[PDB]
């Protein structure tokens, strides 16, 4: 609310909110806020009438309703803005799919149902989840998304940088019956997003979180990759890059495994380090531990690719479902690698 | 006769041999030998087959079709191999 204003008006609204703060008063704090509103009407030369009695009371009553109910009161402009941004993000994702040799079955606004090669699925997931939040570097036709908005030749249309987004991936044999393939895709993307909890901190406190993940499945293997690790998934221009940050790590690691700098034994050798590292309790200890686990399959001479130290302590939970999952994000990273390869 | 021929044989080590273990087991030795279910050293017939086949494909460069038939084609297989290797049991060790 206080940020929604542009101009000296923000002072009035935040001091009203302070009058709403801690059940402070009505009919009483309507002076401090008013000794500025009347100041403002006297700050001009042609004002006609003021019923500040009614007006500041209604202005406080608005925010009081907002907070008591607990939701921004929706007006038609809200709906048409969300829907327009939905369609524009859809236009972005249409050429994001086409950027990765994909075939759209249904891409409409919020959702998506495409078919891509098993090779560029991770790239597409990353770039799509970022473009949904208006954060990208490509021109996608006539549309050049810019850090939370959608620039279209000087037109800055909004985006959905607050809305999370889940992702299901089914690595399927071309002879697999599409009935069960589509049903498994839908049932993962439904069950899992409601049923999984992964560690997140907002306000500096390790809490849980449910949506905005990426589930993978390969004929029995499953993995989940959290996409935000922040509950106001972005609130600054800073956190725009944090989106899908775990995915570029998996992409880099797959970039090392292919070129023959790491051996796929990496994907079968993390279990022994996992006991040590999840009971481990210091940062740089676990840092060196993963560095040397990789440095038994080697990544490089004079190692250069470490895991970015935000990935540890992240524990993924599940509400006791047949979907078995490792309780930690790095084991899920390596299962995502197993699932991607298993389809190549 | 499920099997046409049965060729039991001994494997006398000429030098010291090292068939490595494939395992996520953390052991003391960095590179241990292959172990059977009793912890004795053994040679997985996977390793017997791979090595003996890689050798035969060179000693007898003309009969590569007989070998590819009895021990399976390499890069584009259409059929099951006709020969089977049993895992090598330890039989006697020098002390
Ligand atoms: Mn749903």
Which of A132, A142, A37 is CA-nearest to residue A90? A132
Structure letter (DSSP) for residue A142: S
Q: Which chain B residues have a beta carbon less than 8 Å from that of A272?
A: 24, 26
Which of A191, A324, A336 is CA-nearest to residue A270? A336
How distant is the Cα of A303 from the closest Cα of chain B, in angstroms?
21
Nearest chain B residue to A296 by CA distance is: B30
Q: Is A271 in contact with B26 (Cβ distance < 8 A)?
A: no
Q: Is B26 in contact with A269 (Cβ distance < 8 A)?
A: no
Ligand 1 centre to CA of A200 (Å) is: 22
Q: Which chain A residues have a beta carbon less than 8 Å from that of B24?
A: 268-269, 271-272
Nearest chain A residue to B25 by CA distance is: A272
Ligand 1 centre to CA of A322 (Å) is: 19
Which residues of chain B approach chain A closer than 8 Å at the C-beta?
24, 26
Nearest chain A residue to B26 by CA distance is: A272
How distant is the Cα of A160 from the closest Cα of chain B, in angstroms?
45
Ligand 1 centre to CA of A326 (Å) is: 24
Do residues A338 and A218 touch, judged by C-beta distance below 8 A?
yes
Do residues A246 and A225 touch, judged by C-beta distance below 8 A?
yes
Q: Which chain B residues have a beta carbon less than 8 Å from that of A271?
A: 24
3-state secondary structure of A110: coil
Quote the CA–CA distance of B95 and B81 in Å, as a whole number.
38
Token reading at A130: 């970022």
Quote the CA–CA distance of A201 and A166 in Å, as a whole number.
19
Do residues A298 and A262 touch, judged by C-beta distance below 8 A?
yes
Resolution (A): 2.7
What's the N-to-C CA distance of chain A in angstroms? Answer: 50
Output the CA–CA distances (angstroms, integers) from residue A281 to A275, A312, B15, in the order listed. Answer: 12, 10, 48
3-state secondary structure of A146: strand
SS3 helix, strand, coil % of chain B, rounded to 5? 25, 5, 70
Output the CA–CA distances (angstroms, integers) from residue A1 to A13, A16, B62, B87, in the order listed. Answer: 8, 11, 84, 73
Q: Is A268 in contact with B26 (Cβ distance < 8 A)?
A: no
Quote the CA–CA distance of A180 and A191 in Å, as a whole number.
16
Ligand 1 centre to CA of A144 (Å) is: 30
Residue A151: enclosing H or E segment and its boundaries? strand A149-152
Token reading at A81: 């803005």
A37 annotated to a ligand binding site: no
Quote the CA–CA distance of A9 and A7 in Å, as a whole number.
5
Quote the CA–CA distance of A40 and A135 in Å, as a whole number.
39
DSSP letters along A190-247, please? Answer: HHHHHHEEE-EESSS-EE---SS-EEEEEBTEEEE--S-SSSSS--SSGGGTTTTHHH
Residue B11 contacts by C-beta under 8 Å, 6 or more apart in sequence? B43, B88
Residue showing tokens 């939040």: A133
Tell me which method was used to determine the 3D structure.
cryo-EM
* B21, B26, B28, best to mutate vs chain A, most A CBs in 10 Å: B26
Quote the CA–CA distance of A170 and A194 in Å, as a whole number.
18
Residue showing tokens 């292919």: A258
How distant is the Cα of B61 from the closest Cα of chain A, in angstroms?
31
CA A139 to chain centre: 22
Which of A108, A321, A102, A127 is CA-nearest to residue A224? A321
Ligand 1 centre to CA of A246 (Å) is: 24
How distant is the Cα of B24 from the closest Cα of chain A, in angstroms?
6
What count of CB pairs under 8 Å joins A to B?
Answer: 5
Q: Which chain A residues have a beta carbon less than 8 Å from that of B26?
A: 272
3-state secondary structure of B20: strand
Q: Which chain B residues have a beta carbon less than 8 Å from that of A269?
A: 24
Ligand 1 centre to CA of A125 (Å) is: 19
């Amino acid at each position: 609310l206080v940020n929604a204003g542009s101009g000296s008006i923000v002072d009035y609204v935040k001091t009203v909110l302070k009058c709403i703060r801690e059940n402070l008063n009505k009919c009483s704090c309507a002076e401090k806020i008013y000794s500025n509103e009347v100041a403002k009407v006297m700050f001009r030369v042609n004002v006609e009438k003021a019923n500040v009695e009614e007006e500041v009371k209604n202005s406080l009553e608005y925010f009081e309703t907002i907070l008591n109910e607990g939701r921004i009161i929706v007006t038609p402009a809200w709906h048409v803005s969300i829907s327009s941004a939905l369609n524009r993000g859809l236009l972005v994702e249409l050429e994001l799919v086409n950027k990765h040799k994909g075939f759209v079955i249904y891409a409409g606004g919020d959702d998506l149902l495409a078919m891509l090669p098993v090779d560029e699925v991770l790239d597409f997931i990353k770039e799509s989840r970022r473009a949904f939040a208006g954060f990208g570097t490509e021109k996608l036709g006539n549309m050049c998304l810019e850090n939370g908005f959608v620039r279209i030749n000087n037109a800055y249309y909004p985006s959905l940088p607050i809305v999370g987004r889940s992702y299901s991936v089914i690595i399927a044999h071309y002879a697999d019956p599409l009935f069960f393939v589509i049903n498994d895709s839908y049932n993962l993307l439904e069950e899992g997003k409601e049923i999984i909890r992964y560690r997140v901190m907002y306000n500096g406190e390790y809490k849980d979180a449910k949506k905005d993940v990426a589930i993978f499945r390969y004929q029995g293997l499953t993995s989940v990759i959290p996409l935000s690790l922040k509950r106001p998934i972005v609130s600054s221009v800073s956190d725009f890059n944090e989106i899908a940050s775990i995915i570029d790590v998996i992409l880099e690691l797959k970039k090392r495994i292919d070129e023959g700098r790491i051996s796929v034994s990496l994907l079968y050798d993390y279990e022994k380090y996992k006991h040590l590292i999840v009971a481990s309790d210091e940062k740089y200890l676990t840092e060196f531990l993963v560095k040397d686990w990789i440095k038994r399959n080697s990544l490089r001479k004079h190692v250069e690719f470490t895991i970015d130290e935000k990935l540890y302590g992240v524990r993924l939970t599940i509400e006791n479902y047949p979907i078995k999952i490792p309780n930690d994000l790095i084991s899920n990273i390596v299962y995502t690698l197993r699932i991607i390869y298993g389809g190549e | 006769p499920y099997y046409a021929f049965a060729e039991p044989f001994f494997i006398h080590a000429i030098t010291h041999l090292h068939v490595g273990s494939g395992s996520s087991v953390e052991e003391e030795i960095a590179l241990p030998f292959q172990r059977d279910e009793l912890g004795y050293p053994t040679i997985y017939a996977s390793s017997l087959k791979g090595a003996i086949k890689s050798f035969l494909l060179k000693e007898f460069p003309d009969k590569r079709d007989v070998i590819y038939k009895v021990l399976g084609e390499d890069e584009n297989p259409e059929e099951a191999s006709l020969g089977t290797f049993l895992d090598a049991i330890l039989f006697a060790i020098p002390s």
